[PDB]
């Protein structure tokens, strides 16, 4: 069996995969962490309108 | 054997001891019998066969209404209810004029939602009527 | 003898397999004649026509199982 | 080169081993026979791995702020919070070590997992051609040492937690009375009872190993016997499924841990 | 020898099977149709000529495996 | 010699698959008399007798093959 | 010479199975079908149109079977 | 010799399939019996009467064929 | 003999036990789409699109074997 | 020699049918036992006293299974 | 030659039961969702997400199952 | 020495028989379990007590068949 | 030669009913946590939590077995 | 499989992280937390109508 090929075959496959897991995986996380600072700004926020 | 008692909000339908009685469900049509397992369920429309002492049947129109059965003295609550004779033939065929004119002229859901039950209490009368006969 | 030995198996297998489905093809069906039975036991005499009427079915190639394996153990022996 | 497709697929089952008694790197053609020749992939992968987790998460205890956090830091106290929450379910003593604990065992066991989805070849290659190490493997839960020396440790959890709660009577009539309660079945009840305790680790180590061991050696079939233009095809397929099984094996792990440690102490 | 002696075992595991699916299969369906016919007694025409309808169907096949389990046993034999 | 044992072994097949119809057939039927006896106690010897009558059909094919397994076990 | 018994028990085992998975599988799907007919007295045609669609993926690998089954048997022993 | 070597075996499967039936026949029956408690209680007496009546009939021939293993592994052997 | 003949065995048992598998997965899975279709006759298209959604993975673990017996039936033997 | 090859898989057969049986039917009998211990708490321990008694009878005939095949593996073999 | 010629068989009896296996496994699964969203329309993404994630457990042993008898017929026979 | 490879399938049966019966227990206990935390989420922790007490006797056998064959694997074979 | 060849034959059984096993197992459970998932869905993440407990019991007999076959396959050669 | 010394290495890797994590980790971590989730609790009880 030629190998080189096998290597170029895992290469075309991670590339395809990168490209699921940028539009499918990494967009949560990003949303995730985004909401959680969403609400601890809103909770701070509330936390100094006591001030008032 | 044990007693029945048969209500709705305009009067009461029957009150007293019977030997058996048949009677619509939710479901299907369900049969009673002298200590059985107390149940409680609503009804749809249809009709309670009284088979009384020395085994004589009469026909109670149930267009709606609940049956309850926890103790041995059962109840039967009627949201609209007819007594046999008081219907008639030409009555539940007046329905059916009714009925088959409104399911020509309903044409939406909420209207077929209106006239599906117009149908059944036509339904249930014509299946009353011809039950009274016996 | 070398030739009789395995058609006894031949007959353990059909009626071994026919046994299990007309067994609990029969379970199955009277088991809803019994739950309609408890529902309305006034019908408990048409039911129970519509019940002979259906098992006559259920049985039909079972027995033909049990008829062929009662040949092959008792006529080809 | 005269790689034949068995041969590809047994070279990456093939671990690197070293003799303690030579001490010298070992070859894989032909294997020796005795207890003390250490797995090299095993051991550097998982310390390398809990070494990362401990690195990112001291990096933020060490600099950690009470005001808005930051997007970095808002992803180990998601973690954090979901370790927590998932204790403090399960788990209502006093016990200062159930949740770090159930900390380390998620992220490290995740993280080695994590090692199942890099490309086959890629550290394999680099070890033989750039180093010379004469083989090379690198998913750390692949191997059954590492899953049943964290079921072990596990276990001795289990064991301490017992007995510490209940004391000796406890323990020993638990062991005994159970589960047919009269003393005419006592000699029975030691075999039911001893069973299921010995099960609960061996099933943790056994189930993390069938797990990853059997998802890496998917990768090497596909590498190994099908033509490239279908290697990509299959490998995708198999990876996008894959990160749903690391994420779930590692979950379980921490889980059953919880729960094991949970119905020892109370 | 064996080429008349296997045919019976052949046709024996032929007519077994059948007749667990066409059992187990029609035992299901009429137990539906028991428990329908309870509930709803004034259907039962309309229903039963459903379930012959839909028995047919379950049928189709074993009466394949028990046509030929009959005509290996008794043709090739 | 080879025969015998054989023949042993058809028995325990069909006296096997026997047992497994003639349990789960019943234990399916029983059932459902237990649900409706806990349903209609006075229809308990009503029921009691409708589930005899479809006993005797559940065991009909059971019994052929206890009485072949016994016969090709000791008649043979 | 003997090989062409084993063709027969082959196509045997192929069938009978096929048999099973084609019986018991519509037997399911038509009880499913009756029960919910049952219930309510209408809409059966529409409701009786989704039968034919599922049923005829249920069978679609039994036909294969049995087709194979047939081409065993008389084409090729 | 031989003889003993398959005798145990045959023993073996009919005492094992003769354990699967059983249990499971008085699994399902007595599973509707604690049904009928968690309903309710009152008739625990009366349904473990009509329970033990029935799970006779249920052992009726798994005894059989536990007889004739026992016999056969002890008595043929 | 031994080459041929056992691998029509081998494409039997793949392609009689992916019969079993994709014919009754099928019918567990039809039969809740036909008793929600009772139930929600307006929805039957949007349920008939899950079905869909369900069925293709129901069926492709099966025709894998299909495909490989008729591979190995064809191209093998 | 040839003894144990056959005794050990005798005693195989049979623990592992004693092992299917005993799990099913305590499954079945537990889940039920389950269900009622959730719909009727603080009958608990009156439910969980019936549950032994039918747990007694329903793996009965299994214990036998799993002593002779004891027997056969550390006495016979 | 035998050895190769029964590995063969050995793949077809291992990726044969994986296929039943999550065959009726996936159909079980799907058929609780199928109910479920005929139920709740707003819950078929929702249920259908949670589909997806636990089919994920379902199919983890039969796919490697698979694998390993795909290797034995390639890489081992 | 013929003997060992036997001792492996005779290991097999029984752990196989043993993972069959031990997965399909817990399988339909754990049901009802999630049923009755369905309706009664606030006594997750008084059901999950019992289940654990059921479960032990669910594993009773099946831990001893995967003892033995454990056993027959390494210290026999 | 036929050595090595039933290694594998008896890792193909093994992990055949393995597969079944968890498969099943997993269906049934599953089946159970969607149904509960339809009924109470703002509940999903408690009863997600119960799923992964009981799920790794199901599986953690299975995938002792699954070791093993892969430790004769690989380790035993 | 082959048992082998790496099941003590990784004992001993196993416990000197859970260690690790009990001692540096866990304690600062859950304070530093826990702590803004404090003040937010006062934030609640701070709140001219009274």
Same mark, same amino acid.
């Given at each position: #069996?030629?190998?080189?090929?096998?290597?170029?075959?895992?290469?075309?496959? $991670?590339?395809?995969?990168?490209?699921?897991?940028?539009?499918?995986? *990494?967009?949560?996380?990003?949303?995730?962490?985004?909401?959680?600072?969403?609400?601890?700004?809103?909770?701070?926020?509330?936390?100094?309108?006591?001030?008032? | 054997?044990?007693?029945? %008692?048969?209500?709705?909000?305009?009067?009461?339908?029957?009150?007293?001891?019977?030997?058996?009685?048949?009677?619509?469900?939710?479901?299907?049509?369900?049969?009673?019998?002298?200590?059985?397992?107390?149940?409680?369920?609503?009804?749809?429309?249809?009709?309670?066969?009284?088979?009384?002492?020395?085994?004589?049947? @009469?026909?109670?129109?149930?267009?709606?209404?609940?049956?309850?059965?926890?103790?041995?003295?059962?109840?039967?609550?009627?949201?609209?209810?007819?007594?046999?004779?008081?219907?008639?033939?030409?009555?539940?065929?007046?329905?059916?004029?009714?009925?088959?004119?409104? +399911?020509?002229?309903?044409?939406?859901?909420?209207?077929?939602?209106?006239?599906?039950?117009?149908?059944?209490?036509?339904?249930?009368?014509?299946?009353?009527?011809?039950?009274?006969?016996? | 003898? &070398?030739?009789?030995?395995?058609?006894?198996?031949?007959?353990?297998?059909?009626?071994? =397999?026919?046994?299990?489905?007309?067994?609990?093809?029969?379970?199955?069906?009277?088991?809803?004649?019994?739950?309609?039975?408890?529902?309305?036991?006034? &019908?408990?005499?048409?039911?129970?026509?519509?019940?002979?009427?259906? #098992?006559?079915?259920?049985?039909?190639?079972?027995?033909?199982?049990?008829?062929?394996?009662?040949?092959?153990?008792?006529?080809?022996? | 080169?005269?790689?034949?497709?068995?041969?590809?697929?047994?070279?990456?089952?093939?671990?690197?081993?070293?003799?303690?008694?030579?001490?010298?790197?070992?070859?894989?053609?032909?294997?020796?026979?005795?207890? *003390?020749?250490?797995?090299? %992939?095993?051991?550097?992968?998982?310390?390398?791995?809990?070494?990362?987790?401990?690195?990112?998460?001291?990096?933020?205890?060490?600099?950690?702020?009470?005001?808005?956090?930051?997007?970095?830091?808002?992803?180990?106290?998601?973690?954090?919070?979901?370790?927590?929450?998932?204790?403090?379910?399960?788990?209502?003593?006093?016990?200062?070590?159930?949740?770090?604990?159930?900390?380390?065992?998620?992220? !490290?066991?995740?993280? #080695?997992?994590?090692?199942?989805?890099?490309?086959?070849?890629?550290?394999?290659?680099?070890?033989?051609?750039?180093?010379?190490?004469?083989?090379?493997?690198?998913?750390?839960?692949?191997?059954?040492?590492?899953?049943?020396?964290?079921?072990?440790?596990?276990?001795? =959890?289990?064991?301490?937690?017992?007995?510490?709660?209940?004391?000796?009577?406890?323990?020993?009539?638990?062991?005994?009375?159970?589960?047919?309660?009269? !003393?005419?079945?006592?000699?029975?009840?030691?075999?039911?009872?001893?069973?299921?305790? =010995?099960?609960?680790?061996?099933?943790?180590?056994?189930?993390?190993?069938?797990?990853?061991?059997?998802? @890496?050696?998917?990768?090497?079939?596909?590498?190994?016997?099908?033509? *490239? !233009?279908?290697? !990509?095809?299959?490998?995708?397929?198999?990876?996008?499924?894959?990160?749903? +099984?690391?994420?779930?094996?590692? $979950?379980?792990?921490?889980?059953?841990?919880?729960?094991?440690?949970?119905?020892?102490?109370?």
């Amino acid at each position: #069996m030629n190998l080189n090929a096998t290597i170029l075959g895992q290469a075309i496959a $991670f590339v395809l995969f990168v490209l699921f897991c940028m539009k499918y995986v *990494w967009p949560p996380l990003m949303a995730a962490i985004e909401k959680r600072q969403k609400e601890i700004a809103d909770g701070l926020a509330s936390a100094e309108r006591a001030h008032k | 054997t044990y007693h029945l %008692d048969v209500v709705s909000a305009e009067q009461q339908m029957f009150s007293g001891l019977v030997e058996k009685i048949q009677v619509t469900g939710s479901e299907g049509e369900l049969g009673i019998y002298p200590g059985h397992a107390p149940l409680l369920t609503a009804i749809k429309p249809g009709m309670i066969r009284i088979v009384k002492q020395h085994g004589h049947e @009469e026909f109670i129109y149930l267009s709606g209404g609940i049956l309850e059965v926890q103790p041995g003295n059962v109840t039967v609550l009627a949201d609209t209810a007819i007594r046999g004779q008081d219907l008639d033939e030409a009555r539940a065929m007046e329905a059916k004029r009714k009925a088959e004119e409104h +399911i020509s002229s309903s044409h939406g859901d909420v209207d077929y939602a209106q006239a599906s039950a117009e149908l059944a209490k036509a339904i249930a009368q014509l299946r009353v009527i011809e039950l009274t006969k016996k | 003898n &070398l030739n009789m030995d395995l058609l006894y198996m031949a007959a353990a297998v059909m009626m071994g =397999l026919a046994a299990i489905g007309a067994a609990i093809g029969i379970g199955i069906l009277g088991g809803k004649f019994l739950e309609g039975a408890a529902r309305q036991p006034d &019908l408990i005499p048409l039911l129970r026509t519509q019940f002979f009427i259906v #098992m006559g079915l259920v049985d039909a190639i079972p027995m033909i199982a049990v008829g062929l394996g009662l040949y092959v153990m008792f006529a080809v022996a | 080169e005269n790689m034949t497709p068995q041969d590809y697929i047994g070279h990456h089952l093939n671990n690197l081993q070293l003799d303690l008694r030579t001490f010298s790197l070992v070859d894989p053609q032909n294997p020796p026979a005795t207890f *003390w020749t250490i797995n090299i %992939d095993s051991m550097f992968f998982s310390v390398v791995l809990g070494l990362l987790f401990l690195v990112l998460f001291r990096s933020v205890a060490k600099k950690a702020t009470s005001g808005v956090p930051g997007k970095f830091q808002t992803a180990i106290e998601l973690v954090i919070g979901f370790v927590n929450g998932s204790v403090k379910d399960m788990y209502h003593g006093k016990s200062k070590l159930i949740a770090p604990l159930a900390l380390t065992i998620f992220v !490290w066991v995740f993280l #080695m997992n994590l090692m199942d989805l890099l490309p086959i070849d890629l550290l394999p290659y680099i070890a033989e051609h750039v180093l010379g190490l004469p083989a090379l493997r690198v998913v750390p839960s692949a191997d059954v040492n590492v899953t049943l020396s964290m079921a072990l440790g596990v276990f001795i =959890l289990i064991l301490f937690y017992s007995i510490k709660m209940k004391g000796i009577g406890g323990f020993t009539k638990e062991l005994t009375l159970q589960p047919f309660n009269h !003393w005419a079945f006592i000699p029975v009840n030691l075999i039911l009872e001893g069973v299921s305790l =010995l099960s609960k680790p061996v099933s943790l180590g056994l189930r993390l190993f069938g797990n990853m061991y059997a998802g @890496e050696l998917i990768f090497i079939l596909i590498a190994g016997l099908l033509p *490239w !233009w279908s290697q !990509w095809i299959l490998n995708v397929p198999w990876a996008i499924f894959h990160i749903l +099984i690391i994420t779930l094996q590692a $979950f379980i792990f921490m889980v059953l841990t919880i729960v094991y440690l949970s119905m020892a102490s109370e």
